[PDB]
Design an enzyme around this catalytic site. Sequence first.
Site, PDB file in Angstrom:
ATOM      1  N   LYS A 271     -11.527  -8.051  18.314  1.00  0.00           N
ATOM      2  CA  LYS A 271     -12.434  -7.393  19.245  1.00  0.00           C
ATOM      3  C   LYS A 271     -12.322  -5.875  19.156  1.00  0.00           C
ATOM      4  O   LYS A 271     -13.295  -5.162  19.361  1.00  0.00           O
ATOM      5  CB  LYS A 271     -12.132  -7.818  20.683  1.00  0.00           C
ATOM      6  CG  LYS A 271     -13.007  -8.937  21.222  1.00  0.00           C
ATOM      7  CD  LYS A 271     -12.634  -9.251  22.663  1.00  0.00           C
ATOM      8  CE  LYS A 271     -13.625 -10.206  23.299  1.00  0.00           C
ATOM      9  NZ  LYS A 271     -13.215 -10.558  24.684  1.00  0.00           N
ATOM     10  N   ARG A 272     -11.131  -5.381  18.849  1.00  0.00           N
ATOM     11  CA  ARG A 272     -10.908  -3.949  18.755  1.00  0.00           C
ATOM     12  C   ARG A 272     -11.234  -3.406  17.374  1.00  0.00           C
ATOM     13  O   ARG A 272     -11.311  -2.198  17.166  1.00  0.00           O
ATOM     14  CB  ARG A 272      -9.465  -3.632  19.124  1.00  0.00           C
ATOM     15  CG  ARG A 272      -8.989  -4.327  20.395  1.00  0.00           C
ATOM     16  CD  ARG A 272      -9.849  -3.964  21.554  1.00  0.00           C
ATOM     17  NE  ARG A 272      -9.455  -4.577  22.816  1.00  0.00           N
ATOM     18  CZ  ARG A 272     -10.228  -4.632  23.888  1.00  0.00           C
ATOM     19  NH1 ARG A 272     -11.426  -4.106  23.800  1.00  0.00           N
ATOM     20  NH2 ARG A 272      -9.810  -5.198  25.015  1.00  0.00           N
ATOM     21  N   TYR A 273     -11.463  -4.312  16.433  1.00  0.00           N
ATOM     22  CA  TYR A 273     -11.788  -3.938  15.077  1.00  0.00           C
ATOM     23  C   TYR A 273     -12.966  -4.713  14.540  1.00  0.00           C
ATOM     24  O   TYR A 273     -12.891  -5.345  13.488  1.00  0.00           O
ATOM     25  CB  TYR A 273     -10.577  -4.141  14.180  1.00  0.00           C
ATOM     26  CG  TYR A 273      -9.486  -3.146  14.463  1.00  0.00           C
ATOM     27  CD1 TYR A 273      -8.399  -3.465  15.260  1.00  0.00           C
ATOM     28  CD2 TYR A 273      -9.565  -1.870  13.948  1.00  0.00           C
ATOM     29  CE1 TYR A 273      -7.412  -2.534  15.536  1.00  0.00           C
ATOM     30  CE2 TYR A 273      -8.599  -0.924  14.206  1.00  0.00           C
ATOM     31  CZ  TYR A 273      -7.515  -1.267  15.005  1.00  0.00           C
ATOM     32  OH  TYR A 273      -6.521  -0.343  15.238  1.00  0.00           O
ATOM     33  N   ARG A 274     -14.075  -4.643  15.267  1.00  0.00           N
ATOM     34  CA  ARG A 274     -15.280  -5.348  14.878  1.00  0.00           C
ATOM     35  C   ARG A 274     -15.749  -4.902  13.483  1.00  0.00           C
ATOM     36  O   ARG A 274     -16.621  -5.533  12.885  1.00  0.00           O
ATOM     37  CB  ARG A 274     -16.403  -5.101  15.888  1.00  0.00           C
ATOM     38  CG  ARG A 274     -17.160  -3.828  15.597  1.00  0.00           C
ATOM     39  CD  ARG A 274     -18.633  -4.059  15.592  1.00  0.00           C
ATOM     40  NE  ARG A 274     -19.292  -3.815  16.866  1.00  0.00           N
ATOM     41  CZ  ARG A 274     -20.435  -4.369  17.233  1.00  0.00           C
ATOM     42  NH1 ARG A 274     -21.005  -5.196  16.395  1.00  0.00           N
ATOM     43  NH2 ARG A 274     -20.984  -4.095  18.412  1.00  0.00           N
TER      44      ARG A 274
ATOM     45  N   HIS B  34       0.821  -1.185   0.000  1.00  0.00           N
ATOM     46  CA  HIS B  34       0.000   0.000   0.000  1.00  0.00           C
ATOM     47  C   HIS B  34       0.869   1.254   0.000  1.00  0.00           C
ATOM     48  O   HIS B  34       0.376   2.388  -0.079  1.00  0.00           O
ATOM     49  CB  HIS B  34      -0.861   0.019   1.228  1.00  0.00           C
ATOM     50  CG  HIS B  34      -0.203   0.631   2.419  1.00  0.00           C
ATOM     51  ND1 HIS B  34       0.344  -0.097   3.441  1.00  0.00           N
ATOM     52  CD2 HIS B  34       0.033   1.919   2.710  1.00  0.00           C
ATOM     53  CE1 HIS B  34       0.920   0.697   4.333  1.00  0.00           C
ATOM     54  NE2 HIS B  34       0.740   1.922   3.903  1.00  0.00           N
TER      55      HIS B  34
ATOM     56  N   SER C 179       4.801   3.081   7.845  1.00  0.00           N
ATOM     57  CA  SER C 179       4.341   2.051   6.917  1.00  0.00           C
ATOM     58  C   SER C 179       5.492   1.380   6.186  1.00  0.00           C
ATOM     59  O   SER C 179       6.419   2.057   5.737  1.00  0.00           O
ATOM     60  CB  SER C 179       3.395   2.666   5.883  1.00  0.00           C
ATOM     61  OG  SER C 179       2.098   2.831   6.415  1.00  0.00           O
ATOM     62  N   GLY C 180       5.421   0.057   6.050  1.00  0.00           N
ATOM     63  CA  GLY C 180       6.477  -0.662   5.369  1.00  0.00           C
ATOM     64  C   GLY C 180       7.563  -0.989   6.364  1.00  0.00           C
ATOM     65  O   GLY C 180       8.415  -1.824   6.094  1.00  0.00           O
TER      66      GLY C 180
ATOM     67  N   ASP D 155      -0.869  -6.960   2.453  1.00  0.00           N
ATOM     68  CA  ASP D 155      -0.142  -5.705   2.326  1.00  0.00           C
ATOM     69  C   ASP D 155       1.351  -6.001   2.420  1.00  0.00           C
ATOM     70  O   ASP D 155       1.996  -5.758   3.442  1.00  0.00           O
ATOM     71  CB  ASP D 155      -0.569  -4.731   3.428  1.00  0.00           C
ATOM     72  CG  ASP D 155      -0.061  -3.330   3.185  1.00  0.00           C
ATOM     73  OD1 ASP D 155       0.388  -3.063   2.051  1.00  0.00           O
ATOM     74  OD2 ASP D 155      -0.114  -2.494   4.113  1.00  0.00           O
TER      75      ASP D 155
ATOM     76  N   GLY E 234       3.918   7.255   8.210  1.00  0.00           N
ATOM     77  CA  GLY E 234       5.302   7.357   7.786  1.00  0.00           C
ATOM     78  C   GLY E 234       6.083   6.122   8.184  1.00  0.00           C
ATOM     79  O   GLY E 234       7.181   5.887   7.680  1.00  0.00           O
TER      80      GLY E 234
END
Length: 237
Positions: free
Chosen positions: A160-163, A44, A188-189, A93, A186
């Site tokens: 649970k934190r990302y239903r 991404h 990322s990767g 990703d 920043g």
Amino acid sequence: IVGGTASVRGEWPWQVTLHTTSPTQRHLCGGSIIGNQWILTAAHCFYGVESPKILRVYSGILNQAEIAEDTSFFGVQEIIIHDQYKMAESGYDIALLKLETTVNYADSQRPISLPSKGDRNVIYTDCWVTGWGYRKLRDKIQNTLQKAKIPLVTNEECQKRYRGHKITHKMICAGYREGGKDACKGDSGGPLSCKHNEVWHLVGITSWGEGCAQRERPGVYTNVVEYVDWILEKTQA
Ligand SMILES: *[C@](=O)([C]([C][C][C][N][C]([N])[N])[N]C(=O)[C]([N]C(=O)[C][C][C]([C])[C])[C]([C])[C])C1=N[C]=[C]S1
């Protein structure tokens, strides 16, 4: 990196900073040296990137200030995006950057070991996330590479934190129940290095997260061990 501290030079030798030269040069994403001509990073991180010609990989960097017009860098020959990648939140990703030239290893720049399929039972208790990303939601690229130790959380705990999302076994999360420490824009990767048995393993690749370091909102990473076959296949000329 939110809530971290300055890294010691050479402390994370597999960490590289990926720059884009368009319109003017700037840090785009983090990445990890895994081979003499290979950088493992997030797919991404190449959104809008029509060509590898605008990319520059810098290794052995501590401070972004070390980077100038006369600083040597590695050209990117090819960007290899996983064929099933659509968006970070949906998984896959992961991407490989084949460098135009080979990295001469030294104390400041060496490759990090990939996790073994046998290690999927290991309970990494010494994991660190690093990068030049934001130190807060609305921030800017940092000069000095930051580091933060962060505990892994079970995928069930993460879901649970990302239903609103689907946390698959190809993702791995890390963060504090109360937050405070996390990767951010920043980073990322970037690599999610975990030291096990005196050896550092590239356990995850910084991918996404709701905000940065928010309580009950762990950072989400690509679960590298799930891509060793892909990596080998794409790295084998
Ligand atoms: C990446 O540096 C960031 C990494 C942020 C990781 N966050 C964390 N551990 N809390 N990636 C992104 O910004 C990512 N999007 C999100 O994290 C938003 C997710 C919510 C659920 C909407 C990208 C897909 C945009 C960078 N990636 C691109 C530029 S900086």
